[PDB]
């Protein structure tokens, strides 16, 4: 998509929302079923992608299954399967330790806001036995840096598949943000995301949709 030498475009696809989702309990690293929701919005996401005109060159997703799926679905809605579709355990989600199985409503009233922020977003802290951003981040962008830091710079164009934390460490080191301004950013559930990074790997715009 992206010129060469010019502002490089990643696109970025968040799955929609898993079986558990629906449950709102916590997930980490478990690998839950994708919903209607999260199919429709993949195949919307993926019409989305190919009704505005947006090709791709090269994909990148986690070693997840939502993900793994929903890049399957979107790559096979785009009506673009040829492209290089590739997976990364490194681009998972932030694990969530003993976290795993709690209903947000009881690790809210049991953490509140503030704990539960703390345990889910702070920045470099992470809950009993989870991950943070940084940790998930600093074991993120070895892929992103190794195997995505060479086409970048050519000037292609790439997908993502992976997850909020993910994509918000990718975001967060593509941005090069603060351990106080990272938390507080925001993406799309179901409806993928492009970011406007330039020949180096960084944003040089902002981030921006199809539908």
């Known amino acids: 998509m992206t010129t060469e030498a010019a502002p490089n475009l990643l696109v970025l696809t968040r799955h929609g929302e898993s079986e558990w989702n629906k449950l709102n309990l916590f997930t980490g690293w478990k690998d839950p079923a994708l919903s209607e929701t999260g199919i429709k919005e993949a195949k919307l996401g993926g019409e989305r992608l190919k009704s505005r005109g947006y090709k791709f060159d090269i994909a990148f997703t986690s070693?997840?299954?939502?993900?793994?799926?929903?890049?399957?679905?979107?790559?096979?809605?785009?009506?673009?399967?040829?492209?290089?579709?590739?997976?990364?355990?490194?681009?998972?989600?932030?694990?969530?330790?003993?976290?795993?199985?709690?209903?947000?409503?009881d690790a809210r009233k049991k953490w509140g806001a503030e704990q539960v922020q703390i345990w889910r977003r702070s920045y470099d802290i992470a809950p009993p036995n989870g991950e943070s951003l940084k940790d998930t981040a600093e074991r993120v962008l070895p892929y992103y840096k190794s195997t995505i830091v060479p086409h970048i710079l050519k000037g292609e164009k790439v997908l993502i598949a992976a997850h909020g934390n993910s994509l918000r460490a990718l975001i967060m080191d593509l941005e090069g943000l603060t351990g106080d301004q990272i938390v507080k950013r925001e993406l799309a559930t179901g409806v993928p995301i492009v970011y406007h990074l330039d020949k180096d790997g960084k944003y040089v715009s902002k981030e921006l949709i199809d539908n």
């Open 63 to 105: 070693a997840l299954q939502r993900a793994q799926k929903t890049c399957q679905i979107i790559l096979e809605e785009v009506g673009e399967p040829n492209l290089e579709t590739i997976k990364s355990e490194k681009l998972n989600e932030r694990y969530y330790g003993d976290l795993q199985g709690l209903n947000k409503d």
